[PDB]
Amino acid sequence: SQPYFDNSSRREVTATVGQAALLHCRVRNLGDRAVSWIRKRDLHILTVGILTYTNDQRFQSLHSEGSDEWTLRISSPQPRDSGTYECQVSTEPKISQGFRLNVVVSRAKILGNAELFIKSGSDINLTCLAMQSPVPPSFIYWYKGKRVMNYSQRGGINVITERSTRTSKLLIAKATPADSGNYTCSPSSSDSASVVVHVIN
């Protein structure tokens, strides 16, 4: 007879450039009414039910049949997309719920020169920082060019990853000609950052 919201959707949502943002809106006893997403800034419609209206392919409605959750998915968020998005139900008067999405740029960096030149036999020390992200990363990838690095793939590899300090130190002992290439540090909740290495002898 009367729909109402869930109360546990986390009005404040913080996403990072790239990846994707989710705004979850749950409604109890929907009925024949419909749930819609709008952008308060310019009053632009986004989704109605499961169909998309916006013609900005980045916006998509997610709803599992019979569920109470209507999720607004924003692909490839950008800083301009920071604003208030309202969950709306077709009743009269309509019942709304104002979500506030805030996207931030989170970049990772590797201390030192972007391009390193070390003599064969000397060590490699790549310290990576992901200080911009709001939440500490849950994992940090180390890509040797394109394939994932594994401390066991080569002797003399020391990898210390600390989500407490948002750092990851990759240490390669006694460099060799084969060890050349762009090493990439890709944390979970942040952007990528690479450093190209060249050797001699």
Binding site: I38, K40, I45, V48, Y53, Q88, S90, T91, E92, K94
Partner: peptide, 13 residues
């Protein structure tokens, strides 16, 4: 800021 109609469908109750 209430949705009323889309194409030939009246969303509002």
């Amino acid at each position: 800021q209430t949705i009323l109609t889309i194409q030939n469908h009246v969303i509002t109750k």
